[PDB]
Structure formats: C-alpha cells, structure tokens
Design an enzyme around this catalytic site. Structure first.
Site, PDB file in Angstrom:
ATOM      1  N   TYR B  70     -10.596 -30.269  40.500  1.00  7.97           N
ATOM      2  CA  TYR B  70     -11.929 -30.824  40.078  1.00  7.97           C
ATOM      3  C   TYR B  70     -12.225 -29.825  38.602  1.00  7.97           C
ATOM      4  O   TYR B  70     -12.519 -28.743  38.817  1.00  7.97           O
ATOM      5  CB  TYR B  70     -13.046 -30.644  40.812  1.00  7.97           C
ATOM      6  CG  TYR B  70     -12.747 -31.337  42.319  1.00  7.97           C
ATOM      7  CD1 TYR B  70     -12.935 -32.494  42.643  1.00  7.97           C
ATOM      8  CD2 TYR B  70     -12.076 -30.374  43.422  1.00  7.97           C
ATOM      9  CE1 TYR B  70     -12.598 -33.060  43.946  1.00  7.97           C
ATOM     10  CE2 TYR B  70     -11.568 -30.740  44.649  1.00  7.97           C
ATOM     11  CZ  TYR B  70     -11.990 -32.280  44.798  1.00  7.97           C
ATOM     12  OH  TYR B  70     -11.648 -32.602  46.252  1.00  7.97           O
ATOM     13  N   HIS B 144     -11.350 -43.751  39.644  1.00  6.65           N
ATOM     14  CA  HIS B 144     -12.425 -43.435  40.642  1.00  6.65           C
ATOM     15  C   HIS B 144     -13.724 -44.230  40.203  1.00  6.65           C
ATOM     16  O   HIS B 144     -14.098 -43.994  39.009  1.00  6.65           O
ATOM     17  CB  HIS B 144     -12.632 -41.961  41.042  1.00  6.65           C
ATOM     18  CG  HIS B 144     -12.441 -41.239  42.139  1.00  6.65           C
ATOM     19  ND1 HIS B 144     -13.529 -40.837  42.807  1.00  6.65           N
ATOM     20  CD2 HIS B 144     -11.466 -41.572  42.854  1.00  6.65           C
ATOM     21  CE1 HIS B 144     -13.029 -40.478  44.068  1.00  6.65           C
ATOM     22  NE2 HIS B 144     -11.863 -40.992  44.225  1.00  6.65           N
ATOM     23  N   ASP B 172      -5.358 -45.032  41.893  1.00  3.22           N
ATOM     24  CA  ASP B 172      -5.642 -44.902  43.558  1.00  3.22           C
ATOM     25  C   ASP B 172      -5.945 -46.592  43.748  1.00  3.22           C
ATOM     26  O   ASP B 172      -7.179 -46.871  42.989  1.00  3.22           O
ATOM     27  CB  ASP B 172      -7.098 -44.084  43.662  1.00  3.22           C
ATOM     28  CG  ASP B 172      -7.488 -43.913  44.965  1.00  3.22           C
ATOM     29  OD1 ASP B 172      -7.472 -44.989  45.650  1.00  3.22           O
ATOM     30  OD2 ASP B 172      -7.995 -42.856  45.543  1.00  3.22           O
ATOM     31  N   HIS B 198      -2.229 -42.905  44.913  1.00  2.30           N
ATOM     32  CA  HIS B 198      -3.202 -42.609  46.265  1.00  2.30           C
ATOM     33  C   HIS B 198      -3.054 -43.866  46.800  1.00  2.30           C
ATOM     34  O   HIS B 198      -3.534 -44.933  46.243  1.00  2.30           O
ATOM     35  CB  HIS B 198      -4.396 -41.923  45.724  1.00  2.30           C
ATOM     36  CG  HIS B 198      -4.630 -40.601  45.964  1.00  2.30           C
ATOM     37  ND1 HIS B 198      -5.738 -40.156  45.433  1.00  2.30           N
ATOM     38  CD2 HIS B 198      -3.532 -39.519  45.732  1.00  2.30           C
ATOM     39  CE1 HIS B 198      -5.619 -38.548  45.424  1.00  2.30           C
ATOM     40  NE2 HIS B 198      -4.320 -38.458  45.602  1.00  2.30           N
ATOM     41  N   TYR B 217     -16.602 -35.164  52.020  1.00  2.00           N
ATOM     42  CA  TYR B 217     -16.610 -33.595  52.362  1.00  2.00           C
ATOM     43  C   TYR B 217     -17.247 -33.124  53.529  1.00  2.00           C
ATOM     44  O   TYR B 217     -16.792 -32.273  53.942  1.00  2.00           O
ATOM     45  CB  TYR B 217     -16.920 -32.788  51.138  1.00  2.00           C
ATOM     46  CG  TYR B 217     -16.315 -33.395  49.839  1.00  2.00           C
ATOM     47  CD1 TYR B 217     -14.950 -33.847  49.537  1.00  2.00           C
ATOM     48  CD2 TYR B 217     -16.771 -33.256  48.407  1.00  2.00           C
ATOM     49  CE1 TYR B 217     -14.416 -34.178  48.516  1.00  2.00           C
ATOM     50  CE2 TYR B 217     -16.269 -33.842  47.160  1.00  2.00           C
ATOM     51  CZ  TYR B 217     -15.060 -34.127  47.227  1.00  2.00           C
ATOM     52  OH  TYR B 217     -14.486 -34.811  46.423  1.00  2.00           O
ATOM     53  N   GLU B 253      -3.617 -41.019  51.504  1.00  2.00           N
ATOM     54  CA  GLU B 253      -4.976 -40.274  51.267  1.00  2.00           C
ATOM     55  C   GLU B 253      -5.672 -40.535  52.463  1.00  2.00           C
ATOM     56  O   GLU B 253      -6.644 -41.374  52.210  1.00  2.00           O
ATOM     57  CB  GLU B 253      -5.664 -40.685  49.965  1.00  2.00           C
ATOM     58  CG  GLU B 253      -6.441 -39.462  49.495  1.00  2.00           C
ATOM     59  CD  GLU B 253      -7.140 -39.929  48.293  1.00  2.00           C
ATOM     60  OE1 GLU B 253      -7.239 -41.133  47.818  1.00  2.00           O
ATOM     61  OE2 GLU B 253      -7.584 -38.944  47.436  1.00  2.00           O
TER      62      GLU B 253
HETATM   63 MN   LIG Z   1      -7.996 -40.759  45.604  1.00  2.00          MN
END
Ligand SMILES: [Mn+2]
Ligand SMILES: [Cl-]
Ligand SMILES: [Cl-]
Ligand SMILES: [Mn+2]
Lengths: 274, 274
Positions: B70, B144, B172, B198, B217, B253
């Site tokens: 990140y 994303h 992804d 992903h 998370y 993932e």
């Molecule tokens: Mn991802």
C-alpha cells in the site's frame, strides 16, 4: 507483578505459536493473552502441535491469561450467532485453560446511546455473563473510547446496571487517561471488578487516533507516537506502584513495529526499574 | 495456468513462513504472493530461517510472484516517507526475487476526484514508476472500488495519463465485475498492461461490502457470501478459459475462514475442471 504478551502484537507477521511461547518464556513473561482468532485457528488446524505446547506451559511458568475477542451484541447483530460464538469461546477457554474472555461494550461512545439502546445492551451483556457463568468464566469489558466504557463514570454505571457476578473489567490505562480520568484513581474505583490490565503508552495526546481499531488492524496503519511504557505521557511508574501487589496480569499491548525488539527491551526495564 | 497463494489469507492465524511454503508446495501452487508486512517482518526477524527457505523454493517449483503493499501517494501523505518505503520494498523484492509490487491508486472512487487531485496523483504514480524502473521492477495497480481503478474506463484512462512503461495492472475480476464491466471484456481491454490476477468470488452482489478493507482486516469481520470460485456469481469458467494461456500468476485471494481447507479444495477442482 505478572506480565503477559498479547499475540495481537504479532498480527502482521508470520510466526508460529511455538515461537511465540518460546519468546515469551525466554523474556520472563508469565502469561500469554491469546487473540480469539489465533485461538480458533490453532484449534482448527494446529490442534496436535498446540496440545504439545500447552502440556509444557506450566514447566515454563507460562499460562494463557485470557482470550481476547469481540462479541457483537448491537441491535443490528444476529444474537443467536453471537451466542454460538460464546459457546465456541468456552470450548477454546477450556482447551487453553483460561477462565477469562475480553469483549467490548458496544461500538459507539456512551454519549451516543439513547437510554433505550443502553438498556437493550445491558440486558445482552447480562445474558452473555449468565452463559459464561455456567462455565465458571468471567466476561471482561475493556475500557475503550467509542464504547459504553469510554468514561470512568459510564463504566461504573454499566457495572451497576448489569449487576452480575461474572462481569469484570480489563483496565486499559492509556484509554482511561485519554478519557480525562486519573489512572490511579480509576484503578482504585474499579478495583472490585478488575481481573486484567493492558499497558501501552503514546508520546502525546496528538497521536491518540493511532489506536483507532481500523488503524491498528491495517498493515499499513500509522504507528507514529506509539512508545515504550516509560517513554510516553502516561505515568507508568505511578500505575505499576499501585497495581504491582494485585494478582492480575498486565499485558504489554504493543501495536507498533518490531514487536520482539520492543517487548524484549520492555521486560528488561520492567524487571529492573525503581 | 499458474496459481499462487496469498499470505494475506493467513493474516488471522499463527503460522510460519516455512509452513506456508510447505502448504503451497504440497497443493500444487507455483507461486506465493507475499503481503508486504510479512515480507518486511521476515527480513527483520526471520532472516536466516527465511533465506534457507528461499534457497529451496526453486526445487519445489515455487517463487515469490509479487509483494503486495500500500503506497500512500495522497495529498495528506508524507511523500518522502512513501519514497523511503519504496526503497525498502525494492530491497525486499531483491531478496525475495520478485520484480512486482502491488499498490492501490488512491483511497476514494474516481468520481470523487477533482481533475486537479487526479492530476497530482498521476504525477506521483509516475514518480513511483520511475523509482522502481531503476530496479527493473513493475508497479501493479489493483482494480478496486473506492480507488481511481474502480471502473474499466477510468483504469484505461489512468494508464494513458501516467504513460510509463513500468505501470502495470493486477486484474481483480471480482472487483471488475462489481463495477458493472464484463470480466472477459475487461481482460481483453487491459491485456497490454496485465502482469497478475486475483481470483475470488461472492455468492451474491448483496454481500459485496464484505470486501471492504476495514472488514477484511478486522478479525471479527463478516465473511458471509465469500465462496469458492465455482460456487459464486462471477463466472470463473469463462475467465479461466481466456486467461489460461497467458503467463501471469492468478492468486486465490481468499479472505474467509479455514484458509487451508478452502485453498486445498480449490486446487483439486482447478486442476481437474472442464
Ligand atoms: Mn484483490
Ligand atoms: Cl488440527
Ligand atoms: Cl533476523
Ligand atoms: Mn487494549
């Protein structure tokens, strides 16, 4: 006093339970506070390796002090699902030989509850206490901003409202200080309910937001201002002088980088400070 | 095609790098996508055990496919600090023998940028590309929601605005589908920039919010709706038919519970499906 290590300090690194236990042992910790997700995953996928470890803990003067988790008792919660989680936590506590479960009292500050919401949550905490009381286990609410325990008077009030013998407190002195209360005074007032402590510090009030859960759980989260106990604004000399002759574990709740280095250094100073 | 395992799937359990590598090997993965915080902590505290593992990876037909991190290039960011992190990531990529770093393009949706904010971020991505190009390494932006790559046209536009040879894409497919774009069509349009995939799935659009980073998370985060590839709403049969003769790794993932069981089952079906 007795110090414990929290496995949550290792949430952002690859490390085995065996290596955590060995690190705890060689650094003079007498307890491990096991994060609930770590407990659950050891049970599901590492049961034999973990059982072998548990069978020598006592030889290393180690024990599991508490399992620390999160029980959803909000109105939006599927409460039957929460109850099922409590039943699984009682299984884990039995296996790990601990009689304590840490949870938080709600997900917003006390000032933001209506008297009716606060009533429904008191009733639910009471129900969870009665479930765990069957297993002779204690529910410890952690003192935390943005929960019902975000101030000393609200925490005392909550304890009187639930009025159950198995509801206890995990006293997190940093957060108590953040609320504007004196740490020693809060200890003295909360003493009848305390079963565990969290010890962490910050360099300045300017950095208190680094403890927000979302920031703590994020790998790239900000760690600025997180500092060893004797290097921050909260006075741990005064705190430890008060709590050192209670029987409760104090966890070194480190959320920063380099956990092993920080924890190892902390224990050398804690054992030798005047 | 080549499948990789992400160490982020194990973010809520105690497990060693050695055990992840062994699990990857026995299940027919050919790559490991290493979460940046895991890479960094192995380097700081497990350097010898990790070096021994890295020296046999090739014997197990394994490699590190990418380090996934990140990079803060927002206006609020300390950019010199971001640059210092890039320099450390280049050290880690060298040690792990990978030439790819995954990052996200901003922290809010494309529709929420002013043309001026979007300009400053294009310039910063370009700068990061020029840093990594010195090390012959590629910067992969992940597609994303709540970023500049939250739609197919915005992603294509971003790639044309930065216009640097080391800016690439981690595709992804779940998130691409979420944006309303067709997965195969997005693959075909993004092909010149793709270096990695992903693969994850969801049972229904109703549950897409379980992939919000804060929920992912958090240990107690909701996993409802997360399902194996062939059991969700995105059509992985069509995707794999298109991408199976590209040379890029596809990571499984998985953000749900029981990662080892799910991953092991996935690989058996992936190897044998028609
Ligand atoms: Mn991802
Ligand atoms: Cl097992
Ligand atoms: Cl080391
Ligand atoms: Mn705490």
């Amino acid at each position: 006093m007795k110090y414990s290590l929290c496995t949550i300090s290792f949430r952002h690194q690859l490390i085995s339970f065996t290596d955590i236990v060995q690190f705890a042992y060689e650094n003079g910790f007498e307890g491990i506070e096991l994060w609930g997700t770590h407990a659950q995953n050891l049970y599901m996928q590492e049961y034999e390796t973990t059982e072998r470890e548990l069978n020598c803990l006592k030889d290393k003067t180690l024990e599991i002090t508490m399992i620390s988790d999160y029980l959803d008792i909000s109105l939006s919660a599927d409460f039957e699902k929460t109850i099922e989680k409590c039943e699984q936590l009682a299984i884990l506590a039995n296996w790990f030989k601990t009689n304590k479960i840490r949870t938080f009292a709600g997900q917003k500050g006390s000032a933001d509850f209506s008297q009716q919401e606060r009533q429904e949550y008191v009733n639910r905490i009471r129900m969870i206490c009665e479930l765990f009381a069957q297993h002779n286990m204690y529910v410890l609410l952690e003192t935390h901003p943005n929960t019902l325990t975000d101030t000393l008077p609200s925490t005392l009030e909550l304890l009187g409202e639930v009025d159950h013998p198995n509801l206890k407190i995990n006293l997190d002195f940093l957060h108590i200080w953040e609320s504007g209360a004196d740490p020693v005074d809060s200890f003295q007032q909360l003493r009848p309910w305390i079963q565990h402590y969290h010890f962490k510090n910050i360099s300045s009030a300017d950095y208190l937001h680094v403890f927000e859960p979302n920031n703590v759980y994020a790998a790239a989260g900000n760690r600025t201002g997180m500092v060893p106990l004797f290097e921050g604004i909260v006075n741990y000399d005064e705190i430890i002088q008060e709590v050192r002759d209670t029987d409760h574990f104090a966890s070194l709740e480190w959320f920063g980088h380099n956990a092993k280095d920080i924890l190892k250094a902390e224990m050398k100073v804690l054992t030798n400070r005047n």
